[PDB]
Amino acid sequence: SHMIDKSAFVHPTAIVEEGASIGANAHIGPFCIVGPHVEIGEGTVLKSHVVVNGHTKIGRDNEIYQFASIGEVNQDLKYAGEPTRVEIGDRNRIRESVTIHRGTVQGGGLTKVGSDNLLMINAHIAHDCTVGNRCILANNATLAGHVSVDDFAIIGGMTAVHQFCIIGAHVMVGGCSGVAQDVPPYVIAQGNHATPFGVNIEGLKRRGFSREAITAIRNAYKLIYRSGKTLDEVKPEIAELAETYPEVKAFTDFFARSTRGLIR
Amino acid sequence: SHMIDKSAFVHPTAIVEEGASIGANAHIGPFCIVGPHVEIGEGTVLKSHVVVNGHTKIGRDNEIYQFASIGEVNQDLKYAGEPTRVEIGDRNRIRESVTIHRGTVQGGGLTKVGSDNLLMINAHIAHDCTVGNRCILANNATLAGHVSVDDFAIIGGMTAVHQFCIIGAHVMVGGCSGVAQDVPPYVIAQGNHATPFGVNIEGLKRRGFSREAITAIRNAYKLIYRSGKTLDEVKPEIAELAETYPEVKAFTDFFARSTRGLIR
Amino acid sequence: SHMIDKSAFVHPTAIVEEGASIGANAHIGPFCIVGPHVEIGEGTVLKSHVVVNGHTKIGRDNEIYQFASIGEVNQDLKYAGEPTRVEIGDRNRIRESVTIHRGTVQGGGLTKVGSDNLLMINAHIAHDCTVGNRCILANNATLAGHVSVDDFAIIGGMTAVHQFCIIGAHVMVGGCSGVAQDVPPYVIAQGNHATPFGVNIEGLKRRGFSREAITAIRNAYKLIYRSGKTLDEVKPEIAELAETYPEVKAFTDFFARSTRGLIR
Ligand SMILES: CNC(=O)CN(Cc1ccc(-n2cncn2)cc1)C(=O)CSc1ccccc1Cl
Ligand SMILES: CNC(=O)CN(Cc1ccc(-n2cncn2)cc1)C(=O)CSc1ccccc1Cl
Ligand SMILES: CNC(=O)CN(Cc1ccc(-n2cncn2)cc1)C(=O)CSc1ccccc1Cl
Ligand code: NA
Ligand code: NA
Ligand code: NA
């Protein structure tokens, strides 16, 4: 803490401010700027030309590419320099020009990214976002403020997710989409505004979901989208299904967090 | 002029060419490049890794973030190094990777941005554009050449405005739009190609327009879009309305500048 | 080879690794990074803040702007550091934040860009892409992996081309498009997903195609899109037409490479 490990490498052209913590076998490349409240974990690499600032904690074995901006002042017009936070986990691939901004006081104070994510060129994570584990944001994918992207979700290229929206686990959002409402777990969404196109079967298969689990999830999707019933009508029905198929509880948990209605 | 104020701060790693003017309490951060024909006003901050060049005048209390390119050679295939210009006013927040390019001789020689604007990540202002005051360009918003964005207008994320188009004052263009024709003042536009969706009532309310003014503006919108008359038929009618409600004159002034027809 | 020409200029702040080849009257600007397996041809300019790495060959009289990343590790999840390649030809204008990534072993090992191209701000050329000569990628235009863009083709702003797709010569793809299938030569495409809108007549006229050639190309387009016949039905017919009008052979050559079907 507030120490640069003797096995970390800091390029002579880099500027790491006194107070920064840099772990064993980390690598700060040329022309990087690292502020005094940053913590960079073991084995993390900033290739070159990376700016990291604010109250920002980055885990182990991350790879952050040139022209990325991590921890920076957010774009919220109300933000006025309060000491809000960014947390990033482990083994993320954070590509050229990615931006990850600090929270706002009003939004909870924290922008959080988990582990094993791929954030492709110019992906944007606004203030107060929460990204889980094993997600993909393709090139130019943009999360406006207060967005949640749950585990394994893919946000396609050139896609915007509007403020406060929740993207459930194992979702796939097609490229060139505008997501203006909440996307239930396990769903394929595409378009502007994005609408649902069935369950992400190929994803669930690849990720080892059982036959029974995928059938149950398709049954939950049909309750929401095909039954023609109200969401409040089908909530008990989905809970009843989840009593046998635990993967269906993700719908229940998602309904509790959803504030924008569902894409339809 | 051609002087660096004794109260300006220039990082030792920055490269400011002889001839540049830098005002009192300006701050040029690490790895910035500032060319010889640049003028930077009092209190302006280039955070780090900013390139400013060409015949470029930047006002007071701007905040320009890393990886921005301001004044650079434009993308017009006819441009051949002529000494065209950029002018930027005061109190702008110009975020990471924004690009603002110099004019072309054929297009009038000047790209101009006013004051109190927010240009979000990777917004683009092409050659010969004119942006007013208190505008917002959201992430990846792109103005192709010779575009005007009038005061208070918001261009949503991932939106392109095609060359020569005029966006009137207090417009809101939705995210993921393609604007291929002119947008009258006070209008909501969305889609690809963008089409009108009524007056920006919430914006006008927030910005202190009177009840009478907003009703008059809605009446002007109905003349254009609902009356089913020709634009040339309803111009006198809108001028007549403006004789009582001065805010309606913005329509008249806009018609005189519009060359691409109106979105419909 | 492995030599810096005595007439090349390397800024003192640049970092060019031992083994890099830099030709006569090349210019490496401030804060550039050039790796040991890079070759930069005569007269090429890296303005500032450019990263060039990997097994990468860049020709003569290129202009590469700040915050570009050329030769970098690609975004393919299977790629694991294999010594794949980028080749770039001559007289390209490669604008701010452009990304051009190295190949994958599985995709053929090479990303290739020809000559006299304009790659506008934040254009992206993924692993295993092939871009010809005199192409334009407008701002934020994105080629996903294994895409071909043939000579004179224009990819509009904010447009994504999905993996493996082929864009034929003299195509124009409109801004804000998603191209999910193959685009025949000489065709205008727009939308999400992009659909065809006739032949690019204005382009062909500007580029000196004969009257007879343009009529023949329109006749080939009608066979594909208007005749209501199968593609396999009209292939002989298009070959027969090409026996008189050589420009129609581009259709034949294109059919042989197309794997995703045609946009329709
Ligand atoms: C109809 N098909 C689509 O929409 C495909 N797709 C969604 C998508 C995206 C990525 C994945 N990955 C799976 N493993 C790793 N990545 C899967 C699905 C797009 O985003 C296309 S555009 C694009 C695509 C890639 C890069 C840049 C751009 Cl611009
Ligand atoms: C249907 N609603 C929309 O389209 C919302 N919107 C327009 C818009 C945009 C901004 C404002 N601001 C108002 N005060 C400050 N900013 C208002 C309306 C988008 O651009 C969404 S996408 C996006 C949004 C924000 C950042 C990045 C991205 Cl990508
Ligand atoms: C319906 N018309 C369109 O879609 C126009 N267009 C296609 C296009 C694009 C470029 C050319 N060039 C021809 N010589 C040089 N460039 C021609 C056609 C767009 O890409 C518009 S958006 C945009 C446009 C330009 C820059 C940034 C953005 Cl974002
Ligand atoms: Na809820
Ligand atoms: Na006019
Ligand atoms: Na084929």
Mutation pick for ligand 2 pocket among B154, B171, B195 (CB with most ligand atoms within 8 Å): B154
For A243-260, give one letter per residue: b (16+ CB within 10 A) or e.
eebebbbbbeebbeebee
- Full strand arrangement of the beta sheet holding A21-22: A21-22, A38-40, A55-58, A85-88, A110-113, A130-131, A148-149, A166-167
C78 touching chain A per CB within 8 A: no
Residues 194-213 of A with CB under 8 A from C: none
CB B251 within 8 A of CB B171: no
Tell me the pairing of strands B124-125 and B99-101: parallel
* Annotated catalytic residue, options B89, B90, B124, B128: B128
CB C157 within 8 A of CB C170: no
CA of A29 to the centre of ligand 1 (A): 30
CB C52 within 8 A of CB C32: yes
Mutation pick for ligand 3 pocket among C134, C135, C136 (CB with most ligand atoms within 8 Å): C136
Which helix (H) or strand (E) element contains residue A239? helix A231-242
Neighbours of B81 (CB within 10 A): 6
Beta bridge partners of C58: C40, C88
User: What does DSSP assign to residue B80?
Assistant: -
B179 min Cα distance to partner chain C (Å): 10
Closest listed residue to residue C11, CA positions, set B15, B11, B72, A10: B15
Closest listed residue to residue C111, CA positions, set C155, C139, C79, C140: C79
Interface test with C, best of A15, A48, A65, A96 (most C CBs within 10 A): A96
Of A51, A124, A177, the CB nearest to B48: A51
Of B67, B160, B176, the CB nearest to C67: B67
- Give the dihedral sign, CA C78/C81/C87/C91: positive
CA distance linking residue C32 with residue C46, whole number of Å: 7
A113 min Cα distance to partner chain B (Å): 19
φ/ψ of B233, rounded to 5, equals: -65, -40
C9 touching chain A per CB within 8 A: no
User: Ligand 3, atom 28: nearest CA belongs to which residue?
Assistant: C157
Q: Which ligand is nearest to the CA of C125?
A: 1
CA distance linking residue B173 with residue B134, whole number of Å: 15
Which helix (H) or strand (E) element contains residue B110? strand B110-113
Which parts of chain B fold into alpha helices (H)? 201-206, 211-225, 231-242, 249-257
Neighbours of B226 (CB within 10 A): 10
For A135-170, give one letter per residue: b (16+ CB within 10 A) or e.
bbbbbbbbbbbbbbbbbbbbbbbbbbbbbbbbbbbb
Which atom, in ligand 1's list, is nearest to the CA of C180?
1
A67 touching chain B per CB within 8 A: yes
Both structure tokens of B136: 């917002």
Could you give the count of Cα atoms lying within 13 Å of C193 in the half-sphere of its Cβ? 13
Secondary structure in 3-state letters for A6-40: CCCEECCCCEECCCCEECCCCEECCCCEECCCEEE
Q: What is the dihedral of CA B62, B66, B70, B72, to 10 degrees?
A: 170
Q: What does each C-alpha distance from B228 to B69, B225, B255 come to in angstroms? A: 45, 7, 17
The residue in chain A having the minimum alpha-carbon distance to the alpha carbon of residue C178 is A176
End-to-end CA distance of chain A: 49
CB C230 within 8 A of CB C237: no
Q: What does each C-alpha distance from C105 to A39, A95, B7, C85, C166 come to in angstroms? A: 36, 21, 56, 10, 20
Both structure tokens of A132: 């889980």
Please name the residues in contact with B89: beta carbons below 8 A apart, sequence gap of 6 or more: B59, B113, B114, B115, B116, B133
Residue C148 C-alpha from the chain's centroid:
7
Closest listed residue to residue B164, CA positions, set B57, B45, B60, B257: B257
* Resolution (Å units): 1.8
CA distance linking residue C206 with residue A115, whole number of Å: 52
Please name the residues in contact with C248: beta carbons below 8 A apart, sequence gap of 6 or more: C216, C217, C219, C220, C238, C241, C242
- The answer to whether A99 contacts B120, with C-beta atoms less than 8 Å apart, is no
The residue in chain B having the minimum alpha-carbon distance to the alpha carbon of residue A178 is B176
Give rounded-to-5 percent helix, strand, coil for chain C.
15, 30, 55
Q: Give catalytic status of residue C109 as yes or no.
A: no
Beta bridge partners of A57: A39, A87
Local structure of B94: helix, strand or coil: strand
CA distance linking residue C22 with residue C8, whole number of Å: 7
Q: What is the CA radius of gyration of chain C?
A: 20
